[PDB]
Design an enzyme around this catalytic site. Structure first.
Site, PDB file in Angstrom:
ATOM      1  CB  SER A   1      -0.943  -0.002   1.193  1.00 25.11           C
ATOM      2  OG  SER A   1      -0.770  -1.177   1.958  1.00 25.11           O
TER       3      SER A   1
ATOM      4  CG  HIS B   1      -2.951  -1.908  -2.838  1.00 25.26           C
ATOM      5  ND1 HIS B   1      -2.829  -2.268  -1.510  1.00 25.26           N
ATOM      6  CD2 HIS B   1      -3.881  -0.924  -2.870  1.00 25.26           C
ATOM      7  CE1 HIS B   1      -3.668  -1.556  -0.780  1.00 25.26           C
ATOM      8  NE2 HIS B   1      -4.313  -0.729  -1.581  1.00 25.26           N
TER       9      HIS B   1
ATOM     10  CD  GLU C   1      -4.950   1.562  -5.445  1.00 22.66           C
ATOM     11  OE1 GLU C   1      -4.169   1.265  -4.511  1.00 22.66           O
ATOM     12  OE2 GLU C   1      -5.428   2.721  -5.533  1.00 22.66           O
TER      13      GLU C   1
ATOM     14  CG  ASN D   1      -4.462   3.592   0.745  1.00 23.06           C
ATOM     15  OD1 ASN D   1      -3.636   2.689   0.664  1.00 23.06           O
ATOM     16  ND2 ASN D   1      -5.654   3.418   1.294  1.00 23.06           N
TER      17      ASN D   1
HETATM   18  C1  LIG Z   1      -3.752  -0.948   3.978  1.00 26.72           C
HETATM   19  C2  LIG Z   1      -3.523   0.539   4.123  1.00 26.72           C
HETATM   20  O1  LIG Z   1      -2.414   0.988   4.365  1.00 26.72           O
HETATM   21  C3  LIG Z   1      -4.640   1.550   3.964  1.00 26.72           C
HETATM   22  C4  LIG Z   1      -5.949   0.898   3.603  1.00 26.72           C
HETATM   23  O2  LIG Z   1      -6.485   0.275   4.492  1.00 26.72           O
HETATM   24  S1  LIG Z   1      -6.637   1.017   2.071  1.00 26.72           S
HETATM   25  C5  LIG Z   1      -8.048  -0.049   2.105  1.00 26.72           C
HETATM   26  C6  LIG Z   1      -9.029   0.248   3.241  1.00 26.72           C
HETATM   27  N1  LIG Z   1     -10.279   0.802   2.767  1.00 26.72           N
HETATM   28  C7  LIG Z   1     -11.479   0.483   3.249  1.00 26.72           C
HETATM   29  O3  LIG Z   1     -12.470   1.059   2.820  1.00 26.72           O
HETATM   30  C8  LIG Z   1     -11.588  -0.585   4.334  1.00 26.72           C
HETATM   31  C9  LIG Z   1     -13.007  -0.762   4.879  1.00 26.72           C
HETATM   32  N2  LIG Z   1     -13.959  -1.209   3.872  1.00 26.72           N
HETATM   33  C10 LIG Z   1     -15.217  -0.759   3.824  1.00 26.72           C
HETATM   34  O4  LIG Z   1     -15.678   0.044   4.622  1.00 26.72           O
HETATM   35  C11 LIG Z   1     -16.084  -1.274   2.705  1.00 26.72           C
HETATM   36  O5  LIG Z   1     -16.732  -0.133   2.123  1.00 26.72           O
HETATM   37  C12 LIG Z   1     -17.100  -2.354   3.157  1.00 26.72           C
HETATM   38  C13 LIG Z   1     -16.644  -3.686   2.574  1.00 26.72           C
HETATM   39  C14 LIG Z   1     -17.183  -2.504   4.673  1.00 26.72           C
HETATM   40  C15 LIG Z   1     -18.493  -2.024   2.622  1.00 26.72           C
HETATM   41  O6  LIG Z   1     -19.418  -3.077   2.888  1.00 26.72           O
HETATM   42  P1  LIG Z   1     -20.715  -2.926   3.834  1.00 26.72           P
HETATM   43  O7  LIG Z   1     -21.895  -2.594   2.939  1.00 26.72           O
HETATM   44  O8  LIG Z   1     -20.388  -2.008   4.991  1.00 26.72           O
HETATM   45  O9  LIG Z   1     -20.828  -4.466   4.342  1.00 26.72           O
HETATM   46  P2  LIG Z   1     -20.277  -5.090   5.738  1.00 26.72           P
HETATM   47  O10 LIG Z   1     -21.505  -5.552   6.482  1.00 26.72           O
HETATM   48  O11 LIG Z   1     -19.350  -4.134   6.453  1.00 26.72           O
HETATM   49  O12 LIG Z   1     -19.415  -6.394   5.300  1.00 26.72           O
HETATM   50  C16 LIG Z   1     -18.592  -7.099   6.240  1.00 26.72           C
HETATM   51  C17 LIG Z   1     -19.113  -8.513   6.517  1.00 26.72           C
HETATM   52  O13 LIG Z   1     -18.449  -9.069   7.666  1.00 26.72           O
HETATM   53  C18 LIG Z   1     -19.377  -9.928   8.357  1.00 26.72           C
HETATM   54  N3  LIG Z   1     -19.063 -10.286   9.786  1.00 26.72           N
HETATM   55  C19 LIG Z   1     -18.119 -11.192  10.124  1.00 26.72           C
HETATM   56  N4  LIG Z   1     -18.050 -11.349  11.474  1.00 26.72           N
HETATM   57  C20 LIG Z   1     -18.970 -10.543  12.045  1.00 26.72           C
HETATM   58  C21 LIG Z   1     -19.419 -10.224  13.436  1.00 26.72           C
HETATM   59  N5  LIG Z   1     -18.852 -10.817  14.516  1.00 26.72           N
HETATM   60  N6  LIG Z   1     -20.417  -9.320  13.599  1.00 26.72           N
HETATM   61  C22 LIG Z   1     -21.002  -8.713  12.544  1.00 26.72           C
HETATM   62  N7  LIG Z   1     -20.638  -8.960  11.263  1.00 26.72           N
HETATM   63  C23 LIG Z   1     -19.648  -9.846  10.930  1.00 26.72           C
HETATM   64  C24 LIG Z   1     -20.702  -9.202   8.211  1.00 26.72           C
HETATM   65  O14 LIG Z   1     -21.788 -10.114   8.417  1.00 26.72           O
HETATM   66  C25 LIG Z   1     -20.620  -8.586   6.820  1.00 26.72           C
HETATM   67  O15 LIG Z   1     -21.339  -9.341   5.825  1.00 26.72           O
HETATM   68  P3  LIG Z   1     -22.933  -9.206   5.516  1.00 26.72           P
HETATM   69  O16 LIG Z   1     -23.321  -7.790   5.885  1.00 26.72           O
HETATM   70  O17 LIG Z   1     -23.066  -9.479   4.036  1.00 26.72           O
HETATM   71  O18 LIG Z   1     -23.552 -10.284   6.382  1.00 26.72           O
END
Ligand SMILES: CC(=O)CC(=O)SCCNC(=O)CCNC(=O)[C@H](O)C(C)(C)COP(=O)(O)OP(=O)(O)OC[C@H]1O[C@@H](n2cnc3c(N)ncnc32)[C@H](O)[C@@H]1OP(=O)(O)O
Ligand SMILES: CC(=O)CC(=O)SCCNC(=O)CCNC(=O)[C@H](O)C(C)(C)COP(=O)(O)OP(=O)(O)OC[C@H]1O[C@@H](n2cnc3c(N)ncnc32)[C@H](O)[C@@H]1OP(=O)(O)O
Lengths: 283, 283
Positions: free
Chosen positions: B118, B139, B151, B189
């Site tokens: 990243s 990435h 990416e 990022n």
């Molecule tokens: C690496 C670096 O240096 C810098 C970076 O990090 S760059 C990359 C980071 N960028 C990001 O955006 C990271 C975070 N990602 C996000 O927010 C995404 O937009 C997202 C995937 C969360 C969007 O999805 P969403 O609509 O919010 O769905 P979400 O519910 O969060 O999905 C996660 C799943 O984990 C599951 N899960 C697993 N264990 C669980 C628990 N104990 N309790 C609740 N849910 C759980 C959920 O059930 C969920 O699936 P469903 O909703 O389909 O059942």
């Protein structure tokens, strides 16, 4: 309590607010400059009500029951009937002053005067009215009927009482209210817009294509719409202006507008509202 | 064509990649330093496969049919079997060099060497290998199984051929690939993180509460998670570091880290991974 809402302005926003207060039961006194503008305001409220009747929402007996509550005038002593007036006519500063000055001449010391905006200093406004402590900024979001949030923006002078009242009013209207001390861009625009700008910076730099930048953010951060496509929806002239306010009000090149955003704007490529922006659209 | 994928690293990411190549039919040669780390890599792939069997996805006959394809070694001449190796072991620069240097000693002139990251300059890496034109940055995103994007980051030296191949490879793996010239923060990022930072700036300034900042962005821009809650998920030390890279690599205080983000990090309040960050969590 606030049983009767004042509204100056019957354009897109003012219809919004009014409806949002009516479909709840509050009496709106709507006000504009012609009878034409006023009823055009009512036509839209009704028209939008008839969409809701259609998707099995509300009833035929609420399309009715609401409108009764909307008293839509063209005189401005009518607003004495009100517990609060919300100015929703203009982002032009000097016109805004006048309007609020006039609204301030009509209603009594203890009535609250609000003003919708996205860019105008709430403190700078409040200071033109008799009771500054009774002034508060509001900022509804653009399809007011459905969007469940308002930025409530305290001028330096807004009182705690003035705040709690309009806090409660918002909560009745069915929206979650954010509270924000008057600052350039408040909350949403403050963090959202400089991000849109950073997409233009990235595209300007030759780093990636617009469609792939947009997909990166869609898939990568599960955003509904990529910032560029979004910029085309908002308006690139609307974007530049926000960034100019950011840069000008903070006096910090941190908020430098992207140079490509400047260029597109100069060329007239303003987005969806002109058919061409980051992407090309039909017409 | 690329029938056999090399993978150095069997941690979170490398399991990801491997699976993503296996559930498609490509042969993975996975490599790490112990047999323990390797099978722990396989346990996770299987374990994740058994979730998919459970929610009516895939079949019991693919949990099987995939694993066959995963040849998981602890020797590194095994990677000659491969058409491409993807380094997925480390964000430590000096260790990364070694690994790629070693990978570069084993495989032939025409094999492609990739490196997940990243933050690391792809151009700076590519330049340590024999064939720089055969180097490309990748990435993947963090739950690799389900996230449908990569990416693809061209060092200054990556060839057009080297690009198209790994472009196609990604497309097979079932992800949309973004293409990005090597630049600090690439695309996602680059625009996402300075926004998170702007939320910390807003909260630092006393403008609004964290929960209301977060709701503002959720409801206002239909974002799934508010940036602060999100910062707590990513890690505030992970956030600061990205911002430090932004500021250091561009040499521009535009990317000044937020001062509250610095303070939380100094205090050890790093988020979900320590129970306390912007918000407090259980444990
Ligand atoms: C690496 C670096 O240096 C810098 C970076 O990090 S760059 C990359 C980071 N960028 C990001 O955006 C990271 C975070 N990602 C996000 O927010 C995404 O937009 C997202 C995937 C969360 C969007 O999805 P969403 O609509 O919010 O769905 P979400 O519910 O969060 O999905 C996660 C799943 O984990 C599951 N899960 C697993 N264990 C669980 C628990 N104990 N309790 C609740 N849910 C759980 C959920 O059930 C969920 O699936 P469903 O909703 O389909 O059942
Ligand atoms: C004012 C300023 O100075 C600066 C600012 O602008 S600050 C405020 C601006 N901020 C914004 O985020 C504006 C844009 N808003 C967003 O992107 C929001 O996140 C969002 C409301 C679009 C998120 O919602 P979403 O999940 O994308 O739903 P979306 O589909 O876009 O909703 C729009 C509706 O219009 C409807 N629609 C109406 N006419 C349509 C047509 N001709 N074709 C297709 N759809 C149509 C759609 O059907 C849709 O409803 P459904 O999907 O439920 O059927």
């Amino acid at each position: 309590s606030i049983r009767t809402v004042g509204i100056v302005g019957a354009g897109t926003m003012g219809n919004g607010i009014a409806q949002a207060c009516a479909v709840v039961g509050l009496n709106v006194v709507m006000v504009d400059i012609s009878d034409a503008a006023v009823q055009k305001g009512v036509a839209t409220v009704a028209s939008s009500l008839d969409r809701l009747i259609k998707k099995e929402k509300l009833t035929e007996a609420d399309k009715a029951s609401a409108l009764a509550r909307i008293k839509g005038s063209t005189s401005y002593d009518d607003l004495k009937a009100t517990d609060i007036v919300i100015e929703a006519a203009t982002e032009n500063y000097d016109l805004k002053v006048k309007i609020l000055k006039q609204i301030d001449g009509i209603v009594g010391e203890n009535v609250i005067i609000a003003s919708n905006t996205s860019s105008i200093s709430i403190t700078k406004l409040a200071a033109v009215t008799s009771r500054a402590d009774r002034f508060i900024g509001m900022h509804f979001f653009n399809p007011v009927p459905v969007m469940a949030l308002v930025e409530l923006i305290r001028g330096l002078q807004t009182s705690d009482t003035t705040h709690a009242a309009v806090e409660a009013l918002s909560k009745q209207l069915g929206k979650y209210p954010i509270t924000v001390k008057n600052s350039p861009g408040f909350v949403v625009n403050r963090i959202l817009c400089p991000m849109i700008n950073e997409a233009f910076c990235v595209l300007g730099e030759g780093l990636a294509s617009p469609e792939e930048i947009d997909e990166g953010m869609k898939l990568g951060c599960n955003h509904p719409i990529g910032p560029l496509a979004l910029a085309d929806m908002i308006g690139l002239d609307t974007m530049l202006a926000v960034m100019e306010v950011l840069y000008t009000e903070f006096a910090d090149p941190k908020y430098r507008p992207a140079m490509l955003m400047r260029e597109m704007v100069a060329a007239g490529y303003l987005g969806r509202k002109t058919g061409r922006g980051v992407y090309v659209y039909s017409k």
